Design a binder for these strands. Structure first.
Ligand SMILES: [Mg+2]
Ligand SMILES: [Mg+2]
Ligand SMILES: [Mg+2]
Ligand SMILES: [Mg+2]
Ligand SMILES: [Mg+2]
Ligand SMILES: [Mg+2]
Ligand SMILES: [Mg+2]
Ligand SMILES: [Mg+2]
Ligand SMILES: [Mg+2]
Ligand SMILES: [Mg+2]
Ligand SMILES: [Mg+2]
Ligand SMILES: [Mg+2]
Ligand SMILES: [Mg+2]
Ligand SMILES: [Mg+2]
Ligand SMILES: [Mg+2]
Lengths: 152, 384, 64, 103
RNA sequence: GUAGAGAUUCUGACGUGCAAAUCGAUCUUCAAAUUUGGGUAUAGGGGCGAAAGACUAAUCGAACCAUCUAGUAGCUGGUUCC
RNA sequence: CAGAUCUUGGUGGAAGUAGCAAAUAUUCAAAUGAGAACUUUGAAGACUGAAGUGGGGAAAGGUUCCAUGUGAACAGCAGUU
């Protein structure tokens, strides 16, 4: 497997990825865009706060119809949400990257999220039944997620 | 065909939420230099409504020398404190504020107006300005002198003593009150002398005076065209609802016109209501606030059980006839009239015969605690 | 533990509805090991499984 | 010091004042938990099943206007740095009482 | 008037439906020219019809399947580099 | 080959939108578990109310029955079932 980027010293970075993860691609993109560039420890704090509805993930691109909240203010937006299912996958991937960095002996105090990317995985297909005996798609939009953390 | 007037006034547009709560004086009365120096506006708090009985003095009327019952609105008006002065220069682009001069000391309630969290702040609001006042007392006098030389319009900065009301809000309301009267120099001198001083309601307005009331109306949320604009209810048979307008426009203009009724915000709007008559300027220091020359019973202007959702009115008050914008406890701006009044209705002296002080929390039948005790005798709790 | 089977077997052994079977909540471990109608019968003899009484329906007011 | 037990009267009537009838008893349970969370500052609140019985004694719509409650703040069986409140009912003749500390 | 059998009105709900005909209320009939299971007979210019051109497997002023058949079209659409 | 409401396949914007609201209704504690609004046990509150949401059959299905396990897919939310 190849990560989409190498924006760090190979010897001073760690990697984690997840493939075919059954969580919404659009929500995951918004989470990734928000935690990218954060320090690893603060990313964990922010993700836990989103779980508690103390902070929110701003929805910037896939925002059609998203509701308004005073928790978007800190990011200068009005549309934000708390996609906890996507949060959990990122929390587990961040934990994996941390353990990978602990295995390479990096200084676990300057670790920064240097790269995070969500790609749309192959869709999984279900059916839904519509009026007048019709059948239409009921697809899932799983995601591929990769994370690179590095010393600042 | 089958004509009818349009629903609602195009003069009250857009029907958005007001951008303010306080109530803004859009136009002060024309200044007369021949009169003495006086204030043109005051801030109060809507305590509640009651009703009075008075003898009508209106020759030519069927109710002349007969008793009439009238609803009135009670506004609690403790004295305001003058804390500053603003001078305005007349320019070809309108009035412009030249400079603002503040009192040496400001109380806490007015300084809370400059903060969103006064408690968590360092309370550094006029601390450096205050030190300037007591260093040489020369930049203050220079700023005042510049208002005298320039500045055809002078307004004092005055704030309410909201802590004297039963309101939970501690942050005072602050407004510019134009000083009308003789000469710009006398306006500035009057203003400087009143720094940190109280101006009370009876020095601004008088009995029988016709004034205007400005406030923001009761919030209503959204409303459909039936209640927002008064459109006719569509028939019971109407598929997809009947509380709407049937046709919101023609072909060509291929656009919805701004004059068509639409669902939207129906309340919390800025309004200045004209010609409220002062029926009484009560005094907070006297125990016969609600007594008359015909009802000698010593009672104050608070119904039994207290004003609903307000409390006890212990300060000065005004007893305007009729209704005012806004709910109980909203701050209301009282303004001097821009009009001249010579009608018999406006000029008639008002002398109340009786002021109701029964409970407004129900069908209250006793004006005073003593009247209740006498009518009922003694109860199980009263004996022991 | 999943006592669905024992609840069904106890109803058969006690000759009552499943709604009348009481299984001791403090003896989950012992009850879950039964698996047999003979084992259920031992639970009934030991008081771990009982048949609850019929819901009250009194004729007093009706007779009055 | 941390371990403390007090008796409270909760004015349930004003907390259920406009509530859909099907939601009144379940809402009363949530209100009691929030009440204990506020008084004892414990995130974890446990309701005695006997107290659940008292709340539901008159069915889903007619919760008592007042309830006398015993809140006990105890140490959990997890790490002993976790405090939780256990809420029980108190049988009293008239629930119109003040908060009283239970020794 | 209930079960059962129907289907008048709301021109109600729904009308990318719970549903290619349903849901609610209302209404018709309710001991007979009654309702109905299973067995059995009638088959396409044929059947069957207390008759609406109805019904004959979501198909009816002539079913469905394959073939004749790449049916014919003075008509519509398209017709690929410099 | 740019077209034929062209053919077959793939994939978009609409969109994290429409929506997932009939059939009265759930709650507390415990156990199990990485994880419990949905599993199991106890307690409470309710419903079908014998022309039943009860107990059997005919037709039709065909192993769906039972026990022990599992929990990817499916059970339009969840899953230790
Ligand atoms: Mg896009
Ligand atoms: Mg919407
Ligand atoms: Mg559907
Ligand atoms: Mg209609
Ligand atoms: Mg009243
Ligand atoms: Mg219709
Ligand atoms: Mg050809
Ligand atoms: Mg052909
Ligand atoms: Mg092509
Ligand atoms: Mg072409
Ligand atoms: Mg095409
Ligand atoms: Mg939606
Ligand atoms: Mg019923
Ligand atoms: Mg019943
Ligand atoms: Mg059976």
């Amino acid at each position: 497997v190849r990560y989409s980027a190498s924006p760090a010293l190979e010897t001073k970075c760690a990697k984690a990825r997840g493939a075919y993860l059954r969580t919404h691609f659009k929500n995951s993109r918004e989470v990734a865009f928000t935690i990218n560039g954060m320090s690893l420890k603060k990313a964990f704090i922010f993700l836990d706060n989103v779980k508690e509805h103390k902070q929110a993930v701003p929805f910037r691109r896939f925002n059609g119809g998203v509701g308004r909240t005073a928790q978007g203010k800190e990011f200068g937006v009005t549309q934000a949400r708390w996609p906890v299912k996507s949060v959990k996958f990122f929390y587990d991937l961040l934990k994996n990257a941390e353990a990978n960095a602990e295995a390479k002996g990096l200084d676990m105090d300057k670790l920064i999220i240097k790269h995070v990317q969500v790609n749309a995985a192959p869709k999984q297909r279900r059916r839904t039944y519509r009026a007048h005996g019709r059948v239409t798609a009921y697809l899932s939009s799983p995601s591929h997620i990769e994370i690179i953390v590095a010393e600042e | 065909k089958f004509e009818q007037p349009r629903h609602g006034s195009l003069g009250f547009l857009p029907r958005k939420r007001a951008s303010r709560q306080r109530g803004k004086v859009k136009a002060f009365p024309k200044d007369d230099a021949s009169k003495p120096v006086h204030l043109t506006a005051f801030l109060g708090y809507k305590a509640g409504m009651t009703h009075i009985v008075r003898d009508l003095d209106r020759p030519g009327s069927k109710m002349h020398k007969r008793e009439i019952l009238e609803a009135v609105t009670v506004i609690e008006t403790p004295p305001m404190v003058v804390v500053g002065v603003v001078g305005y220069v007349e320019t070809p682009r309108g009035l412009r504020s030249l400079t603002t001069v503040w009192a040496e000391h400001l109380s806490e309630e007015v300084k809370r107006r400059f903060y969103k969290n006064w408690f968590k702040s360092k309370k550094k609001a006029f601390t450096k300005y205050a030190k300037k006042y007591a260093e040489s007392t020369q930049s203050i006098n220079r700023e005042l002198e510049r208002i005298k030389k320039y500045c055809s319009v002078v307004r004092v900065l005055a704030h309410t003593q909201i802590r004297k009301t039963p309101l939970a809000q501690k942050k005072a309301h602050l407004m510019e009150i134009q000083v009308n009267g003789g000469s710009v120099a006398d306006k500035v001198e009057w203003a400087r002398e009143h720094f940190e001083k109280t101006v009370d309601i009876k020095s601004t307005f008088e009995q029988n005076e016709m004034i205007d009331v400005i406030g923001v109306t009761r919030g209503k949320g959204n409303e459909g065209t039936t209640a927002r604009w008064g459109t006719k209810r569509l028939p019971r048979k109407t598929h997809r609802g009947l509380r709407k307008v049937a046709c919101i426009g023609a072909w060509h203009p291929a656009n919805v016109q701004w004059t068509v009724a639409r669902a939207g915000n129906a309340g919390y709007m800025h309004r200045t209501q004209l010609n409220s008559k002062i029926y009484r300027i009560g005094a907070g220091d006297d125990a016969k606030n609600a007594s008359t020359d015909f009802d000698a019973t010593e009672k104050r202007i608070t119904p039994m059980g207290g004003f609903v959702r307000y409390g006890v009115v212990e300060n000065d008050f005004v007893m305007l006839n009729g209704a005012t914008p806004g709910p109980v406890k909203r701050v209301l701006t009282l303004r001097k009239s821009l009009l001249t009044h010579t009608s018999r209705k406006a000029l008639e002296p008002v002398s109340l015969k009786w002021i109701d002080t029964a409970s407004k929390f129900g069908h209250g039948r006793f004006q005073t605690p003593a009247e209740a005790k006498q009518f009922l005798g003694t109860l199980k709790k009263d004996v022991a | 533990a999943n006592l669905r089977t024992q609840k069904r077997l106890a109803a058969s052994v006690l000759k009552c509805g499943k709604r009348k079977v009481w299984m001791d909540p403090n003896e989950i471990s012992e009850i879950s090991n039964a698996n047999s109608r003979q084992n259920i019968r031992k639970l009934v003899k030991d008081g771990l499984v009982i048949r609850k009484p019929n819901l009250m329906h009194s004729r007093f007011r009706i007779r009055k | 010091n941390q371990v403390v037990t007090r008796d409270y009267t909760i004015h349930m009537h004003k907390r259920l004042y406009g509530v859909s009838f099907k939601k009144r008893a379940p809402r009363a349970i949530k209100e009691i938990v929030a009440f204990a969370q506020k008084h004892m500052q414990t995130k974890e609140v446990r309701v005695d099943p006997s107290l659940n019985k008292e709340v539901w004694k008159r069915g889903i719509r007619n919760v008592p206007h007042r309830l006398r409650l015993r809140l006990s703040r105890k140490r959990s069986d997890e790490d002993d740095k976790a405090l939780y409140t256990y809420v029980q009912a108190v049988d009293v003749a008239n629930p119109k009482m003040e908060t009283t500390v239970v020794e």
